[PDB]
Design a protein around this ligand. Structure first.
Ligand SMILES: Nc1ncnc2c1ncn2[C@@H]1O[C@H](COP(=O)(O)CP(=O)(O)OP(=O)(O)O)[C@@H](O)[C@H]1O
Ligand SMILES: [Mg+2]
Ligand SMILES: [Zn+2]
Ligand SMILES: [Zn+2]
Ligand SMILES: [Zn+2]
Lengths: 85, 107, 551, 177, 97, 171, 270, 112
DNA sequence: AAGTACTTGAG
RNA sequence: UCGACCAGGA
DNA sequence: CTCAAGTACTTTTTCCGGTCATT
């Protein structure tokens, strides 16, 4: 079975430009789909602006499955990933 | 290694695979006058052991096909008596990294 | 997207298995028996004939009525039919590979002309690559002009070992139009190899042998390169061009099939009736021609199968052949909705990352926003503003899934927006949009910009973003694309935005700097002789939107 | 639709499986050797009426417990008691599970888990298909002729006296009412 | 407007995958077909109001899925089939690699 | 006959349900779909076992609609009838054509001619019976039948049975 | 053609550059694993100049009264003289700088010292001075250990490839080879103290902001490296025509077509 | 040494019109023609003949013929290339789609 | 126009 | 409502 | 029975109103 164990992960401990953009879009779409929000919308209304607060607080409950060319993959949480970008 | 002057009979040259496991290699004198490996543009090619190779493919998660290939007929491959499937580690100099190393599977 | 709910699970294509249609399959896949060259008009009646162009197939006249499958037009795809050919005919495309397979196998017992016995043959068979293995095996067997009964043994060449039986000299096969002719041998015997002849020889080629050649036991047998049962594409493929009621008008592909069916009916009558034997070869070659001509009409042998007009006739090959072809013109690039284009003009009072959108354009393009408690109150004021006011909306999309045209709807004044509905609203200031200028030879030729709804009919754009687009304002036009998803919006604003595109990776330097007036004036402003008195200095400072407030 | 455990795909090959019987040719789905949650090999699980009734009870009972956890912040009489648990753990619209639980309660041979497990130990030492092993625990038979007529798979698989020794131990094992 | 091949290339360069899809599908061609899970063809005589699916020929009335492909891709495959070429679309994998 | 089968189901959640009690809705959803279902492949899916250890797995979010898809692997009690399978059942319906018998969730119809000759119809009774020299078969009587064949009529399975053979009939 | 040839080539989460077949094209993007946007031309002052001027610039000899770090450059300057243990450290330091010089003169045979590299070190030092109001009057708080060992440790953190094995740890070592040459060139014990006049405080800031900047500078897995490259060669060629020995568009055609009979075959003989 | 010479010549046709291209791009085109073991022309004759996807190759220069030989030799397309996904109207495994997005229930209950 | 990919034909 | 020619724009 | 020459084939930048015939 393909799936690298947490302890054996080797990809950038930092979130990619492409990663952040898909996380930010996915949550934006979900917040707009009437999904539950894990942050205080402090007068906020735009779902991307909301999703941004969620990623800032690292309270986005999604995981990136980084697939390697052999099919095997590493799972990284948005909580795990460093956001220097 | 058989170093001939001008030619070898097509009759005689068709006796090379007649003695396995052993192997024969034909070389023209004029071709060997200059060591092509010594030229500016020719980097260092290095033969990988069955294990060195096995490890490379493991560490890069590669199928033999996925590797860049060196032709059997290749001047450097001929210099190192490279056999189908043998891998060479090519250490070149980079204007970008300083040193970059590639690999080539034999043809 | 295909419209209406289906209980079937939604999946993504992960593999595409190419093969050939076996006659047996063509018959099973078929919904109608297709036997009359007449499309429709069940003798005068404006209804389709139960024999071609819906003898059950797809649909016409926007009738759900489509062989009980209901659905109709946007929903029902096509439904394939079939037409059993009177004689086997070659497929134009495989005409050469058929020849090359004949050049490899014994034209009498169907055994590969070369065996595991020939040493060069063992080497060719050792090739992993399906196409390269075929190539090497052909080059080898083309030479062999006899199906050997016995070949010398691997040990001593003194003692011969028997392989596949029968002697027989093999022909030297050559093409003559859409026919294959041999040359067996003072003076040779030269005859045409029949489509049926080739077929029964191919039908005799063993799995081991034909899989040693390109072929696959399940997906593509050599025998399937010859056509027996023709698949009839449904109307959605070959639409009837109706230019009123009485004005029928059928497609080119419909004419060619009718012609094949016309040619078939003749060949079958000659056979099933008083066989004139040498008139049969005439009607047979005509069928070969039409079946050929329908799939390819840009064939080497001169007859262009011209439609009586002086027009050649669009083959199926011609339909897909690149740039305008189905691949390059319909799939690699498409015409798109949520698009706009007008003359561009330069604005120094715009932000680098803004784009001036003419109110006309802002009022036609639309972003579908989901009715969420966050927007619910604003969205209602847009719906109530309607499609004519600037901040307004064009349609309300219900939970039920049905469009409300606020332009007409009797309830356009009303509408109590429930959550989960969508409001297709006019583009507003600060929406992400993809802006581009053709020819698009750059990552930079298309950049994401914030909207700024302005009056007057041009796209106004900051002058320093002129260089990446390579645009001038001498009557250049530019394209605008409106994303429809909240996730697609993010894509633009997070990767494609102009500020991001500033430093270019092709040159490892910034692809936009200060240009023209501002560059000429920055030199003038700078130089030691330039001094500014208080009255003007203060205006200069106010102009900086981020001025600290410090003189 | 609910997806299987076995993944033996039919690449183009139309040809479907032969008929099913007591030639013990069940489906491809119901083979003897099959794929476990862990991806392990595991023998087919076939239950007899009573082995089957207790399993369903066990699940719903522990589901009613899970439904009471989440909501924090004698045959004639066994039928009514079962029908009450169904009203509490099942979707109601499960008309099949009601008829099945009534059938199982009015057709089961062994009431208690002890008597069921004893029957399970008894039969699962013959080395017959879980089919035969369950059928033997399901249909009440007197003769080895009776048994070997109804379960005609058994025919050469067991001795006539041996099967009859089991049949007569299953009788002494039958629960009352 | 024509979102040309060039225009596609830029979107690729950028990495805007979901956008490229929205352009090519949602904002154009986007269509839904029912394909068979045995012979991967657009056969399936799917009467939706009745919830009947069936691919006669495969006899299969169960192993049927729904895909979203550009209508012109539907058209392409139909044209290839008309030319005796079987462009079988499978929703699973085999080869691995 | 009653089997325990290791099965899966791909349920597709919607973003509104991406809340603290998500698992609960998925488990509850699996039951909606799967429990009380009937396929030909596995037959009647009667009851999902071990509600506590139902494996939900990590769900993947589908592009262009945040809805997430989870392959909910589970284990259930199934009933799949077979040819030659001998069943014990109760009479339900009874006409001049024969009688239907309830076997678990499924019904097995026993044709007039799949019965011994001596056993003949009696319309003149409430309820209508099938009377023999010894036996009497009516709407509440218990029977033992051999399944001669099966048919998968949508969300059900029906069988045709016989009580003609030895050791079969009334109990 | 260039686009259709390169489409499918991208960087994978393993820093390897591969096509739709997963066949490796480059083992690491552009032989260095760096995003081309994050690259500025920077000199390598170890390449050029006389062998004398080099020794002046980088040699510190705590065992020679004339060639020591003056006690006006660092606080420890007085008690540092004769410290054979620290001279051991400073010997390896210089020995490596000489190694570096030989290596760089090997790579760039012409002596060209201006090359595009990530992390503009000049700007970092330039800032540290304006940030920490570095007065070029008073002596530094840094130790020979602080500088020497600090730079040694910074290097271990300039990660491109993570792999815990030896093929990858050797690949890591290799991709940084040139940037480190630049790093050691710019942060020599002499150069840091005599030229830059850095306080320990400033040095740690420079050291962190190099690590920081380097890391950001690396390529992103997903980068459509294939298309990019095709447009990067493409656009120039298309503009080098649109505006009003074989060379230009015709020779480029020759090259891309791997044309056999080429128009101007020549052979430069040394 | 072929790669070296090839890059040298490419580089000079670009540097010929003053124009600067960052090494990597020319390096990549050069590396691509080369990896195969020889000099793979950027023509239908060279790159378009490789073991890549049928749908991908038919998207350039020899379209219908590529597809005909696809059927005649029962080719199987990975659907790994950009072109294939674009023909299929599927989110390509390109940049933003080079990874997958998952929801973790562990974290969904932790964030409340 | 410039490859390719073959036949066609001389020694 | 179909597509061919011609003439144009940056 | 090798290898020169003749044979055929397939490409050719990107987007963006009028007039004709006939569907
Ligand atoms: N046939 C063609 N194909 C593609 N693009 C074209 C084209 N003709 C013009 N262009 C576009 O227009 C740009 C330059 O053309 P123009 O704008 O008409 C000249 P200009 O910039 O106004 O003044 P100049 O002549 O002083 O340069 C090109 O770089 C190109 O992007
Ligand atoms: Mg212009
Ligand atoms: Zn239909
Ligand atoms: Zn023969
Ligand atoms: Zn099918």
């Amino acid at each position: 079975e393909k799936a690298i164990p947490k302890d054996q992960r080797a990809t950038t401990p930092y979130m990619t430009k492409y990663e952040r953009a898909r996380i930010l879009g996915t949550r934006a779409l979900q917040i707009s789909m009437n999904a539950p929000v894990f942050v205080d919308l402090e007068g906020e209304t735009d779902p991307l602006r909301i999703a941004m607060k969620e990623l800032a607080e690292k309270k986005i409950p999604l995981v990136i499955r980084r697939y390697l060319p052999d099919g095997s993959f590493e799972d990284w949480s948005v909580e795990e990933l460093i956001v220097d970008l | 290694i058989f170093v001939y002057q001008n030619n070898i009979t097509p009759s005689a040259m068709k006796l090379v695979p007649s003695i396995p496991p052993a192997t024969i290699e034909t070389f023209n004198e004029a071709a060997l006058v200059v060591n092509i490996t010594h030229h500016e543009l020719v980097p260092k090619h290095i033969r990988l052991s069955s294990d060195e190779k096995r490890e490379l493919l493991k560490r890069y998660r590669l199928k033999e096909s996925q590797l860049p290939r060196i032709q059997r007929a290749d001047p450097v491959a001929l210099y190192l008596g490279l056999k189908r499937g043998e891998v060479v580690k090519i250490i070149r100099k980079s204007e970008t990294s300083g040193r970059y190393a590639s690999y080539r599977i034999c043809m | 997207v295909g419209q209406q709910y289906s209980s079937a699970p939604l999946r993504t294509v992960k593999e595409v298995q190419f093969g050939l249609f076996s006659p047996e399959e063509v018959r099973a896949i078929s919904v109608a028996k297709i036997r009359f060259p007449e499309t429709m008009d069940e003798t005068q009646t404006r209804a389709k004939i139960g024999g071609l162009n819906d003898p059950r197939l797809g649909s016409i006249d926007r009738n759900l009525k489509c062989q009980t499958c209901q659905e109709g037009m946007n929903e029902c795809p096509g439904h394939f039919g079939h037409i059993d050919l009177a004689k086997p005919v070659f497929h134009v495309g495989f005409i050469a590979k058929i020849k090359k397979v004949c050049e490899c196998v014994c034209m009498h017992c169907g055994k590969l002309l070369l065996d595991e016995h020939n040493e060069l043959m063992r080497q060719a068979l050792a090739i992993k690559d399906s196409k390269k293995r075929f190539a090497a095996i052909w080059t080898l067997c083309k030479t062999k002009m006899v199906c050997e009964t016995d070949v010398p043994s691997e040990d001593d060449p003194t003692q011969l070992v028997s392989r596949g039986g029968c002697g027989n000299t093999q022909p030297t096969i050559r093409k003559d139009g859409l026919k294959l002719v041999g040359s067996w041998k003072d003076e040779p015997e030269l005859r045409v190899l029949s489509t049926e002849e080739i077929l029964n020889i191919f039908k005799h080629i063993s799995v081991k042998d034909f899989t040693s050649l390109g072929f696959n036991e399940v997906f593509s047998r050599p025998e399937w390169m010859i056509l027996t049962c023709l698949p009839v594409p449904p109307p959605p493929v070959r639409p009837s061009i109706s230019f009123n009621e009485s004005q029928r008008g059928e497609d080119d592909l419909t004419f060619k099939l009718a012609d094949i069916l016309k040619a078939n009916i003749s060949l079958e009558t000659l056979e099933h009736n008083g066989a004139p034997h040498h008139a049969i070869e005439e009607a047979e070659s005509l069928l070969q021609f039409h079946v050929a001509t329908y799939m390819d009409n840009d064939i080497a042998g001169q007859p262009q199968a011209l439609q009586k007009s002086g027009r050649p006739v669009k083959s199926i090959r011609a339909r897909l052949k690149g740039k305008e072809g189905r691949i390059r013109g319909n799939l690699m690039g498409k015409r798109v909705d949520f698009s706009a284009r007008t003359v561009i003009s330069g604005d120094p009072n715009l932000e680098l990352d803004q784009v001036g959108v003419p109110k006309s354009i802002a009022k036609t393009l639309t972003y579908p926003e989901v009715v969420t408690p966050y927007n619910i109150d604003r969205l209602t004021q847009l719906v109530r503003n309607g499609p004519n006011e600037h901040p307004g909306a064009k349609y309300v999309i219900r939970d039920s899934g049905d469009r409300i045209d606020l332009r007409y709807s009797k309830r356009a004044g009303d509408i109590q927006l429930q959550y989960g509905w969508k409001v297709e609203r006019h583009i507003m200031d600060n929406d992400p949009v993809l802006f581009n200028r053709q020819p698009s030879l750059h990552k930079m030729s298309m950049m994401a910009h914030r909207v700024k709804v302005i009056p007057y009919s041009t796209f106004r754009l900051n002058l320093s973003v002129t260089s990446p687009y390579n645009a001038d304002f001498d009557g250049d036009e530019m394209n605008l694309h409106v994303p429809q998803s909240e996730e697609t919006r993010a894509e633009l604003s997070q990767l494609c935005a102009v500020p991001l595109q500033i430093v270019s990776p092709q040159s490892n330097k910034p692809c936009m700097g200060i240009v023209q007036d501002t560059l000429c004036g920055i030199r003038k402003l700078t130089l030691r002789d330039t001094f500014i008195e208080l009255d003007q200095v203060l205006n200069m400072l106010y102009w900086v939107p981020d001025w600290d407030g410090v003189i | 639709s609910t997806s299987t455990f076995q993944t033996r795909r039919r690449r183009l090959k139309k040809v479907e499986e032969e008929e099913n019987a007591a030639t013990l040719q069940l489906g491809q789905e119901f083979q003897l050797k099959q794929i476990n949650h862990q991806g392990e090999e595991e023998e087919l699980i076939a239950l007899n009426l009573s082995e089957a009734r207790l399993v369903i009870k066990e699940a719903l009972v522990e589901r009613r417990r899970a439904f009471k956890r989440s909501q924090k912040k004698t045959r004639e009489k066994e039928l009514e008691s079962i029908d009450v648990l169904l009203e509490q753990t099942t979707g109601g619209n499960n008309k099949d599970l009601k008829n099945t639980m009534q059938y199982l309660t009015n057709f089961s041979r062994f009431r208690d888990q002890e008597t069921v497990g004893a029957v399970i130990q008894l039969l699962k030492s013959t080395g017959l298909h879980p089919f035969e092993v369950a059928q033997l625990g399901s249909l009440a038979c007197d003769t080895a002729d009776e048994a070997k007529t109804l379960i005609p798979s058994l025919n050469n698989k067991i001795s006539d006296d041996e099967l009859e020794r089991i049949l007569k131990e299953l009788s002494n094992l039958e629960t009352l009412y | 407007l024509r979102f040309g091949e060039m225009e596609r290339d830029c979107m690729i360069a950028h990495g805007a995958a979901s956008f490229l899809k929205e352009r090519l599908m949602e904002a154009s061609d986007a269509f839904r077909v029912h394909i068979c899970g045995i012979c991967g063809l657009m056969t399936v005589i799917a009467k939706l109001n009745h919830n009947q699916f069936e691919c006669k020929g495969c006899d299969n009335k169960i192993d049927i899925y729904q895909i979203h492909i550009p209508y012109a891709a539907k058209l392409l495959f139909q044209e290839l089939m008309a030319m005796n070429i079987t462009p079988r679309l499978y929703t699973d994998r085999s080869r691995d690699f | 006959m009653f089997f325990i089968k290791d099965l899966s189901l791909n349920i597709t959640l919607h973003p509104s349900f991406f809340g603290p009690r998500m698992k609960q809705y998925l488990k509850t959803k699996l039951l909606e779909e799967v429990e009380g279902s009937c396929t030909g492949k596995f037959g009647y899916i009667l009851c999902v076992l071990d509600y506590d250890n139902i494996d939900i797995q990590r769900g993947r979010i589908l592009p262009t609609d945040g809805s997430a898809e989870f392959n909910v692997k589970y284990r259930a009690v199934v009933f799949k009838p077979f040819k030659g399978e001998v069943v014990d059942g109760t009479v339900v319906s009874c006409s001049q054509h024969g009688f239907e018998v309830q076997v678990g969730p499924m019904k097995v119809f026993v044709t007039k001619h799949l019965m011994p000759q001596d056993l003949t119809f009696n319309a003149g009774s409430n309820p209508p019976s099938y009377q023999s020299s010894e036996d009497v078969i009516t709407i509440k009587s218990r029977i033992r039948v051999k399944i001669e064949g099966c048919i998968s009529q949508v969300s059900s399975i029906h069988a045709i049975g016989s009580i003609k053979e030895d050791y079969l009939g009334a109990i | 053609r260039l686009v259709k040839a390169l489409e499918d080539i991208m960087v994978h989460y393993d820093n390897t550059t591969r096509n739709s077949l997963g066949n490796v094209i480059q083992f690491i993007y552009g032989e260095d694993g760096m995003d081309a946007a994050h690259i500025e031309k920077q000199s390598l002052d170890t390449i050029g100049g006389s062998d004398a001027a080099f020794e002046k610039r980088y040699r510190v000899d705590l065992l020679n009264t004339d060639h020591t770090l003056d006690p006006s450059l660092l606080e420890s300057g007085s008690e540092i003289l004769g410290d054979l243990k620290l001279q051991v450290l400073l010997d390896e330091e210089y020995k490596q700088l000489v190694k570096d010089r030989k290596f760089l003169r090997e790579v760039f045979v012409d002596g060209e010292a201006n090359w595009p590299l990530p992390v503009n070190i000049r700007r970092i030092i330039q800032n540290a001075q304006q940030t920490f109001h570095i007065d070029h009057t008073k002596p530094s708080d840094l130790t020979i250990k602080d500088i020497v060992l600090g730079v040694k440790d910074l290097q271990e953190n300039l990660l491109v490839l993570r792999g815990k094995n030896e093929i990858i740890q050797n690949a890591q070592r290799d991709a940084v080879t040139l940037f480190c040459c630049l790093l050691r060139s710019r942060l020599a014990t002499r150069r840091v103290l005599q030229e830059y006049r850095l306080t320990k405080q400033a040095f740690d800031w420079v050291l962190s902001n190099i690590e920081a900047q380097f890391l950001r500078s690396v390529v992103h897995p997903g980068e459509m490296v294939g298309v990019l490259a095709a447009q990067s060669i493409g656009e120039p060629a298309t503009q080098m025509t649109l505006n009003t020995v074989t060379s230009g568009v015709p020779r480029l055609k020759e090259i891309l077509n791997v044309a056999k009979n080429m128009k101007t075959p020549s052979l430069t003989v040394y | 040494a072929g790669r070296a010479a090839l890059y040298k010549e490419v580089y000079n046709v670009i540097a010929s019109d003053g124009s600067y291209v960052n090494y990597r791009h020319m390096a990549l085109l050069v590396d691509v023609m080369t990896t195969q073991g020889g000099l793979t022309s950027v023509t239908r004759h060279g790159f378009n003949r490789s073991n890549t996807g049928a749908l991908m190759r038919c998207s350039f220069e020899e379209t219908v013929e590529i597809l005909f030989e696809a059927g005649a030799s029962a080719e199987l397309d990975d659907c790994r290339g950009v072109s294939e996904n674009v023909i299929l109207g599927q989110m390509a495994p390109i940049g933003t789609g080079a990874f997958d997005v998952m929801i973790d229930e562990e974290s969904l209950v932790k964030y409340m």
